[PDB]
């Protein structure tokens, strides 16, 4: 429900919310503290899973 445009920073549990709000498996983003870019995804267990830089 906030995008830039294709073509700010949070924290894993906010990148999930989006991740859903949008319906995708997986979100690319940046890292609150880090300021890396990390990727949230849901897994297939269920469980959701998370990557850094």
Do not use: C, W
């Not at 924290?11 to 870019?37: C, I, K, P, R, W």
């Amino acid at each position: 429900e906030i995008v830039r445009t294709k073509q700010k920073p949070m924290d894993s549990e906010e990148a999930v919310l989006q991740m859903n709000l949008l319906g995708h498996s997986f979100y690319v983003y940046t890292d609150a503290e880090t300021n890396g870019t990390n990727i949230v995804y849901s897994r297939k267990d269920g469980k959701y899973g998370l990557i850094e830089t």
